[PDB]
């Protein structure tokens, strides 16, 4: 049987400061006991001063990050280059993720 | 494109009339006269066939009087083919209702259904309406004996006696003159035939030019019987009533 999911390892860490935030992640990508890459970036600048990472199954992660980045682009087009606030970004991501409620994006996402 | 050739069958005239409905009624006015008369102990349906040659096989012929179920019949005026489309639809609705509720369809419900179909052709779809007017003769255990009519507009109304097709103006006056509420089936049979005999465009009214039917509860153990009269029986009732 075909298993559509995989595990690409990795670990990410968000910490909110008083007038700043950090999102960190290791750059190792793996499958099982093999190293795929020792430098495969996982935490992305998505524009509008928002950083994102979707750790877990790297394909579903890349897909989601790509879709959100595009969601930022289309938010600018559709709302007169208005800045997407972080709380709005979060709600937008909820709908992206719940959209595949019955075939989930196999990722733990942090912005 | 195609718009060029569209008659636009479902529009209002400036006066607020539906062109095609009006013209379909004009069509129906030329069709053979059909009469329904409701008595206290039954309903009579009488109707005049048209054109007729000596070579028309009358005993296997049905252009006017059709059976919808065991309780309800119709008399037709207009395009026979158009009527048979609607009849087969009505025959189904009756059986759908029977299947659903395990009770025979009430006469008014069936009539409304058919009349709602006719209405649909006047409001949407871009098709010509059905060039048919029905007289519905039927019985149910709510209202007893019922007469209705419907016409291409999809409007239906209830009657004690009524005509459709040709010379309805003349027919309805003669019925309005001789009808009474306490009347009986045998009398209504006579009234129906007398009315047709006067309003006919033929020289005389004969058995070969008539279809005839009665819905009597007049049966053993209070059950409704439909009688579609055979050619020989229409000939007898013409002699009985003294028209031939």
């Amino acid at each position: 049987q075909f298993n559509p999911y995989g595990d690409n390892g990795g670990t990410i860490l968000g910490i909110a400061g008083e007038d700043f935030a950090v999102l960190a992640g290791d750059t190792r990508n793996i499958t099982d006991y093999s190293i795929n890459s020792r430098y495969e970036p996982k935490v992305f600048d998505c524009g509008d001063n928002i950083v994102m990472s979707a750790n877990g199954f790297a394909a579903d992660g890349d897909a989601l990050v790509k879709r959100f980045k595009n969601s930022v682009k289309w938010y600018h087009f559709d709302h007169n280059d208005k800045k997407l606030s972080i709380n709005s970004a979060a709600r937008n991501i909820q709908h992206l993720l719940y959209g595949k409620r019955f075939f989930p994006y196999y990722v733990h996402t942090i912005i | 494109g195609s718009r060029r050739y569209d008659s636009r069958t479902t529009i209002f005239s400036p006066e607020g009339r539906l062109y095609q409905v009006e013209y379909a009624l004009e069509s129906i006015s030329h069709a053979g006269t059909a009469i329904g008369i409701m008595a206290s102990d039954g309903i009579v349906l009488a109707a005049e066939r048209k054109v007729t040659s000596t070579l028309l096989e009358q005993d296997t012929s049905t252009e006017k009087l059709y059976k919808l179920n065991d309780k309800i019949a119709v008399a037709v005026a207009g395009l026979t083919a158009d009527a048979e489309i609607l009849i087969n639809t009505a025959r189904i609705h009756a059986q759908n209702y029977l299947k659903t509720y395990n009770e025979d369809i009430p006469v008014e419900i069936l009539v409304r259904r058919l009349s709602d179909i006719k209405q649909g052709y006047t409001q949407h779809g871009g098709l010509r309406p059905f060039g048919v007017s029905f007289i519905y003769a039927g019985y149910d255990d709510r209202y007893g004996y019922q007469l209705y009519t419907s016409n291409p507009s999809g409007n239906y109304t209830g009657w004690k006696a009524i005509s459709v097709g040709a010379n309805t103006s003349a027919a309805q006056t003669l019925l309005q003159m001789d009808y009474k509420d306490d009347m009986k089936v045998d009398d209504a049979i006579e009234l129906a035939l007398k009315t047709l005999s006067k309003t006919t465009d033929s020289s005389a009214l004969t058995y070969d030019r008539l279809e005839f039917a009665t819905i009597r509860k007049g049966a053993n153990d209070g059950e409704v019987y439909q009688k579609i009269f055979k050619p020989q029986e229409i000939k007898d009732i013409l002699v009985k009533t003294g028209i031939t």
Partner: protein
């Protein structure tokens, strides 16, 4: 499907098919609605060109949409049945999902929305019908009377008439209906409704139908004799 745009604008900014639908309403038998203090009365004309009718089974001019709301109309009879069916279905659907019967304003707004839909949908003509929708909201004793028309507009009326010679009976109601003091009782309300019809009806009690709607789903249709007593009393006072 048949897609043809039948209701369209003309150079002067009129949608003729909607206006020609109003002419079908103008042709229809007169209907009137008069709301009292604690009731609404729907009066309706029955043309006497049709005798030998069976009044037991002939479709009555006033229709119940639910146990607390009624709909009368002027115009094409076949068209009215479609609006009545849709309204009745929506009345039960509202009870099913909101656990509360429709307000008269809601039911009106729905019917009016259906009429509007037919004026800018392809392949369909407008309804040749105007409605008077009357009743009482759930657990409410304020009377409600609304009017709709083919274009899809609707509004609330202290009293209103539609159909043939509605101009005349609206003339009558405009002078005879006082807003500061409406018909206090059912008697007064029915009387004013019959009077207003007698301006146009020009004939006996068989040609007038009356339906009285009161609060808490209390709807009753008056008989020929009950109406005939109002007809007798109005003309005896008039002889003076």
């Amino acid at each position: 499907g048949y897609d043809r745009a039948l209701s369209i604008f003309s150079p002067d900014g009129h949608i003729f098919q909607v206006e020609y639908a109003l002419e079908a309403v103008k042709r229809g038998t007169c209907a009137v609605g008069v709301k009292g203090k604690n009731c609404v009365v729907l009066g309706c004309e029955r043309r006497s060109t049709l005798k030998l009718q069976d009044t037991r089974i002939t479709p009555s001019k006033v229709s119940k949409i639910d146990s607390h709301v009624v709909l009368s109309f002027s115009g094409l009879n076949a068209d009215s049945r479609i609006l009545i069916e849709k309204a009745r279905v929506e009345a039960q659907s509202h009870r099913l999902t909101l656990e509360d019967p429709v307000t008269v304003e809601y039911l009106t707004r729905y019917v009016a929305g259906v009429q509007q839909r037919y004026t800018q949908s392809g392949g369909v003509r407008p309804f040749g019908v105007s409605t008077l929708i009357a009743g009482f909201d759930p657990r409410d004793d304020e009377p409600k009377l609304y009017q709709t028309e083919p274009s899809g507009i609707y509004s609330s009326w202290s009293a209103q008439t539609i159909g043939r010679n509605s101009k005349t009976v609206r003339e009558f109601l405009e002078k005879n209906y006082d807003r500061k003091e409406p018909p206090a009782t059912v008697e007064e309300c029915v009387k004013l409704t019959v009077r207003s019809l007698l301006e146009v009806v020009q004939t006996g009690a068989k040609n007038i139908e009356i339906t009285v709607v009161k609060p808490d789903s209390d709807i009753v249709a008056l008989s020929s004799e009950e109406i005939n007593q109002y007809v007798t009393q109005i003309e005896q006072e008039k002889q003076e």
